Design a protein around this ligand. Structure first.
Ligand SMILES: O[C@@]1(CNc2ncnc3[nH]ccc23)CO[C@H]2C[C@@H]1C2
Ligand SMILES: [Cl-]
Length: 167
């Protein structure tokens, strides 16, 4: 039993809710919140820009030190950093950004990072400003993640389409 509330159960381990991941994180304080990161951990917009703003830019400061030490992530890769005031940990995961021409096949690799964590609050990878089809992202999520994932979908119209089209 965990403290996530109001989610529709898609599968044994995947749950979905129309919610602002920032507000969800501030309520639940999950062990792990997933960020829709880019390889540079430049949290300018989308989910990343919103999560960073909620940390008063502390996420960006920590991220810049991480990059200065380790260099960029790989597309499909991840790193674990602090969750600041939002969660214990933030798993920064880089899905392919279609608006950059990155291979959508890397989306499965991106979701595989979730399997290293028993429970996660997460957005759909590569959705929104990363330019992938969110229906496809949900399908890859369900077919790849085996741990318990609670998906927050900000757009209510998108949330309804994801549920009504789910196979
Ligand atoms: O859910 C999407 C990804 N962006 C987010 N998801 C959850 N909480 C969020 N908080 C801020 C941004 C944000 C996927 O497609 C459309 C609907 C949005 C963009
Ligand atoms: Cl977005």
């Amino acid at each position: 039993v965990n403290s996530f509330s109001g989610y529709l159960k898609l599968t044994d381990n995947v749950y979905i809710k129309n919610a602002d991941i920032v507000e969800e994180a501030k309520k639940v304080k999950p062990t792990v919140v997933v960020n829709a990161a880019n390889v540079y951990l430049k949290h300018g917009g989308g989910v990343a820009g919103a999560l960073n703003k909620a940390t008063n830019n502390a996420m960006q400061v920590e991220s810049d030190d991480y990059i200065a030490t380790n260099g960029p992530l790989k597309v499909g890769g991840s790193c674990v950093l602090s969750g600041h005031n939002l969660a214990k940990h933030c798993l920064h995961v880089v899905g392919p950004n279609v608006n950059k021409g990155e291979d959508i096949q890397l989306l499965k690799s991106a979701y595989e990072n979730f399997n290293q964590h028993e429970v996660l609050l997460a957005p759909l990878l590569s959705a929104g400003i990363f330019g992938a089809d969110p229906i496809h992202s949900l399908r890859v999520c369900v077919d790849t993640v085996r741990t318990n994932v609670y998906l927050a979908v900000f757009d209510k119209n998108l949330y309804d389409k994801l549920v009504s089209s789910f196979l």
